[PDB]
Amino acid sequence: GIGGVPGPHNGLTDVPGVRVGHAGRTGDGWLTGVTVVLAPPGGAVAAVDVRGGGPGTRETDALDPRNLVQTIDAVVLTGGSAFGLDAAGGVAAWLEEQGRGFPVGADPSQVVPVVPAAALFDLGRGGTWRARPDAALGRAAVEAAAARPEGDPVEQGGVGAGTGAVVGGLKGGIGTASVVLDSGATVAALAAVNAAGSAVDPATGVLYGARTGLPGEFAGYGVPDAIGADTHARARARLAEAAEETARRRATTLAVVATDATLTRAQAQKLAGTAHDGLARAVRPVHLLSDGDTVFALSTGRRPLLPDRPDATAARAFGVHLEAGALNEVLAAGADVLTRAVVHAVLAATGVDTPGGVHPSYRELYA
Amino acid sequence: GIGGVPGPHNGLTDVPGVRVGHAGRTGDGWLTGVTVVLAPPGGAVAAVDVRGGGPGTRETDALDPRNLVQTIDAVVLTGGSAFGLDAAGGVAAWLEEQGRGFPVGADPSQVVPVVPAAALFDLGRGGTWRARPDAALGRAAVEAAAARPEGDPVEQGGVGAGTGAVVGGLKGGIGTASVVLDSGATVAALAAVNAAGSAVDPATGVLYGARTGLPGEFAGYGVPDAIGADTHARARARLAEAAEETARRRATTLAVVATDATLTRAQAQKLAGTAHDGLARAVRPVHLLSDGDTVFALSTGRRPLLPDRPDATAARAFGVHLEAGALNEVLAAGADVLTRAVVHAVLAATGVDTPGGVHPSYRELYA
Ligand SMILES: *CC(=O)CCNC(=O)[C@H](O)C(C)(C)CO
Ligand SMILES: *CC(=O)CCNC(=O)[C@H](O)C(C)(C)CO
Numbered sequence: 001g002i003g004g005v006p007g008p009h010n011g012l013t014d015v016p017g018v019r020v021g022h023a024g025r026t027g028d029g030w031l032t033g034v035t036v037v038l039a040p041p042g043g044a045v046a047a048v049d050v051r052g053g054g055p056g057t058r059e060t061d062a063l064d065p066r067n068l069v070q071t072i073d074a075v076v077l078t079g080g081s082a083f084g085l086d087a088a089g090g091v092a093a094w095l096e097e098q099g100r101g102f103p104v105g106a107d108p109s110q111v112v113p114v115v116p117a118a119a120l121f122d123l124g125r126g127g128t129w130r131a132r133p134d135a136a137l138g139r140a141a142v143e144a145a146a147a148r149p150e151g152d153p154v155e156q157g158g159v160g161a162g163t164g165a166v167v168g169g170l171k172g173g174i175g176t177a178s179v180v181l182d183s184g185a186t187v188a189a190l191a192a193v194n195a196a197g198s199a200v201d202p203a204t205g206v207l208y209g210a211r212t213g214l215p216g217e218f219a220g221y222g223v224p225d226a227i228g229a230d231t232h233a234r235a236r237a238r239l240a241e242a243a244e245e246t247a248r249r250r251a252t253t254l255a256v257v258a259t260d261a262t263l264t265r266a267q268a269q270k271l272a273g274t275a276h277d278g279l280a281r282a283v284r285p286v287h288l289l290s291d292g293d294t295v296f297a298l299s300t301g302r303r304p305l306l307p308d309r310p311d312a313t314a315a316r317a318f319g320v321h322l323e324a325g326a327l328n329e330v331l332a333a334g335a336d337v338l339t340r341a342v343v344h345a346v347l348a349a350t351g352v353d354t355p356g357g358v359h360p361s362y363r364e365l366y367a
Numbered sequence: 368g369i370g371g372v373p374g375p376h377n378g379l380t381d382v383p384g385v386r387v388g389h390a391g392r393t394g395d396g397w398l399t400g401v402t403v404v405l406a407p408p409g410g411a412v413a414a415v416d417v418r419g420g421g422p423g424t425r426e427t428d429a430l431d432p433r434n435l436v437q438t439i440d441a442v443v444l445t446g447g448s449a450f451g452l453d454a455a456g457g458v459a460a461w462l463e464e465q466g467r468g469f470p471v472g473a474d475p476s477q478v479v480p481v482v483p484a485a486a487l488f489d490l491g492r493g494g495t496w497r498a499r500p501d502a503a504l505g506r507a508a509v510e511a512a513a514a515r516p517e518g519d520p521v522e523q524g525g526v527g528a529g530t531g532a533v534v535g536g537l538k539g540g541i542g543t544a545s546v547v548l549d550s551g552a553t554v555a556a557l558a559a560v561n562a563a564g565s566a567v568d569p570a571t572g573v574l575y576g577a578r579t580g581l582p583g584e585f586a587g588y589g590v591p592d593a594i595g596a597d598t599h600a601r602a603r604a605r606l607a608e609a610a611e612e613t614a615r616r617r618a619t620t621l622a623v624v625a626t627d628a629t630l631t632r633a634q635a636q637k638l639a640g641t642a643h644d645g646l647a648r649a650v651r652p653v654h655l656l657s658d659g660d661t662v663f664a665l666s667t668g669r670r671p672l673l674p675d676r677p678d679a680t681a682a683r684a685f686g687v688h689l690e691a692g693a694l695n696e697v698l699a700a701g702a703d704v705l706t707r708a709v710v711h712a713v714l715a716a717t718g719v720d721t722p723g724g725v726h727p728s729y730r731e732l733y734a
Contacts, residue, residue: 051640053637053698054684197699201578203578211568211570270420270656273418273654274652274654274655276644276647277643277644277647277651277652277653277654280644280645280647280648280702281647281648281651284579284644284648284699284702285641285644285695285698285699285702286644287640287641287644287698288641288695288698288699289637289684289691289694289695289698290684290685290691290695317421317655317656317657318657324656324657327656328652328655328656328657331420331652331654331655331656332564332651332652332655335647335651335652
């Protein structure tokens, strides 16, 4: 009864201790930003799965299950394509100042922060080609995460890494969702949706990810349950026109999935992997050479995976395995929270019109 | 142009020179079998992506892009869980008899066949726990493949590896689909569907994969595309009946994706990866610890990726890259054909009732 519903704010921060910060620059040629997910003091077990064919990434080898540093404090998601990876340097600097990183000496101030990053391509979308996130903007983002209270609703839409995100020609952005499992563990996702493929079924106008939604969760946005053939046809025409104008004017989904269920790094790497199936149910096509799709998975380690006295109803792989049963539930939830966070990204967005592109939002076309 | 429609029979053998063979055993305790995809003489460039958390496989390392043997002749999909991998030895023996394999000597008869295989769990579904595919059954499957003409319609349903296959409690089976690209290249999938998760949305009775179907392709199966609340209620209860009876009596999707577009092994390996997204769109949940989901990708290397009129209509990644654009189309097609093949598997199945299980088909419940 207590599972199958969202956590308190239906977002990443429903995983207690997890913090989210956005920093962006809009106007005067700029339409880009950075989003930082910051783990609670002491770090979180982290893993990654880079599945798109055209990634821009940093520090992903350090996250291999074989390797030395198992827990990290921060994950960076950034615009500005590979240049935007510069933002991570500013987050490492802040963490160092905070004394947070892997200890490399006797002096507890001697730490080396392991800061993975992934980037999305938004170059020129504000008008100025070289307007990209830098160290200072990465630092701003992590400082804003540190400044938030625990369990603060995550801000969605055209903010942080989603500031210049575009999804199938429509304005994309930041989206987030959570679910509580029957065990009391929370699983949640945050996504910066910048897909080259479409979040929208081109035959009907329906959001691919919608049917994975929990009851009523999208209502606060106000979108018809039937989409008329005419509404959809006008929408397609508008989008084709914004796309043609965008093109004349011009002369990847990044995600973090988190849970408070205690996962080893290998299990978190499997979670990052199953989250990609949630992405596939929300966007089509995905993971192509032109997509940089990357999922980071975090576990705060606060709840055991399996409760202390299992029922006949506890999930069991092959009828017998309780740990694998409990892990399957987390993995399937990882997919579902990412599908749902994609839909929220698409519904939370508002359109833009700059010298670097015209991108109407889903609601502007269908609401 | 000519793309976005099926090839002549809407199946793997639309990829010219590709052959499919099934051998199975039904009755007297048995409900299992083997399916072999047999490439044309000279072999096919092959790769693999094992994404399920509970695989049973053979000879997957030999298909790494870095390694020695880049082309192979046969891929084996088998029932019988890990025991059923024995079937591949019979296929290797037959290929050696044919002089087909990696040359290991000046003598042309001296070959070592690289025969990758994957297995699906169907133990005891015929009534007898130890009735599993063996080498003779694998040999029968590849002999059956070799005797087929080119372009032969693929047999679907409870045949071959699909003989004992079950998908979310419903009878699973073999399914297949193809699509032609604008280039004239064909991309196709064959799937043996045995998922622990569901091919059906539990709120509507709708097949997850259907909205990826090509218009009209499923019409022959005589299944409504809008399901009444009364039908759905009856179907749920019937399945739950079968499932309880199955449990009393007793008390993974494997796929080959092929194309004639010339691909490098690394390109085919990416294709085996994107195909898994198409599996995600047909089955939920998937890729879990209890799923042994495996995709093998084959290229017959008969048509260049690029034809020769690079119209402002030939796809281009980032507006400029012709080769990456053409590959993107194959990668996206690889996902879609596997989604559609899964639906065909579900629709082609007919139900079973044996001492080891009761598994009604989707059509028996919904049509
Ligand atoms: C999906 C997307 O926005 C592409 C993200 N990747 C990049 O921007 C890379 O740095 C590219 C593909 C431009 C260069 O390797
Ligand atoms: C998806 C499925 O049918 C299971 C395929 N894998 C197996 O049968 C393995 O051999 C198991 C998981 C039983 C043991 O490693």
